[PDB]
Design a protein around this ligand. Structure first.
Ligand code: HEC
Length: 85
């Protein structure tokens, strides 16, 4: 399952800084619905690019994660965001 796979990817790669949809480094850049909309990060392309390319203290995962995992993770974040985390 892509959403099921996205969760596995999230756990092994994203929870270190975003467990529960938060942001352990920059408290304002969370994965919550309203913040994601405010930052224009609520679409699949925008999130997959940020994951692939990284940004500031967030690492780039293009090298390490295969394209499918980056997508499934993006979708996982979006669904969780809409369910409230
Ligand atoms: C800590 C070492 C991080 C890891 C591992 C991941 N992310 Fe991250 N993310 C982190 C920071 C410090 C920031 C803010 C970057 C900046 O300078 O603005 C982010 C941001 C995001 C966002 C955008 C959130 C928003 O705009 O409110 C997303 C969608 C995001 N991060 C996703 C994400 C995913 C899915 C990860 C696993 C592949 C991931 N991040 C890991 C820090 C860290």
């Amino acid at each position: 399952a892509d959403l099921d796979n996205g969760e596995k990817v999230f756990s092994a790669n994203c929870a270190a800084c975003h467990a529960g949809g938060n942001n352990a480094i920059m408290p304002d850049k969370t994965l919550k619905k309203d913040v994601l909309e405010a930052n224009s990060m609520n679409t699949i392309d925008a999130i997959t690019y940020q994951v692939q390319n990284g940004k500031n203290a967030m690492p780039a995962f293009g090298g390490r994660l295969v394209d499918e995992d980056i997508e499934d993770a993006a979708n996982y974040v979006l669904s969780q965001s809409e369910k409230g985390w």
